[PDB]
Design a binder for these strands. Structure first.
Length: 122
DNA sequence: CCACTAACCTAATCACACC
DNA sequence: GGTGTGATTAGGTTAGTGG
């Protein structure tokens, strides 16, 4: 199961596009300020900037540095918990990620990244 | 029925710490 | 240099939205 898909309000769409037009590669600071300004969690803002870049460069090929998120510290205690879940299922649904996020105190968006990196290497 | 797109994905790479 | 790992990128896939 996936997370329930969002549907943007006209007010939100216009703010995403107006910001994208000035900087298609925003940092964590720009993403977080925009996310709270429009009432959307920052992870979904990031997902949109990745998607919007895809369809822009996709269409540009048919027609024609900001600071990153600060590194998330992961204790050996939480890594062991993540690693036991990983050996059972490598593609946890949103429920299983929100579960592990609750048990670790880490943001669910970072659990999703951890499983992406762990699958590609182990 | 079907076009669009958030959500999700892989593969490669960047960034930063570390010995 | 060489490892390890979180975060980001290009771009392809899955599945919900809505014409």
């Amino acid at each position: 199961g996936r997370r329930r898909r969002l549907v943007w309000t006209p007010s939100q769409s216009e703010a995403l596009r107006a910001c994208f037009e000035r900087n298609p590669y925003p940092g964590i600071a720009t993403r977080e300020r925009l996310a709270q300004a429009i009432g959307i969690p920052e992870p979904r803002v990031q997902i949109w900037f990745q998607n919007e870049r895809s369809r822009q460069l996709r269409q540009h090929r048919r027609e024609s540095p900001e600071g990153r998120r600060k590194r998330t510290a992961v204790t050996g205690s939480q890594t062991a918990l993540l690693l036991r879940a990983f050996e059972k299922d490598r593609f946890p649904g949103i429920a299983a990620r929100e579960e592990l996020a609750r048990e670790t105190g880490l943001p669910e968006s970072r659990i999703q990244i951890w499983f992406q990196n762990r699958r590609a290497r182990h």
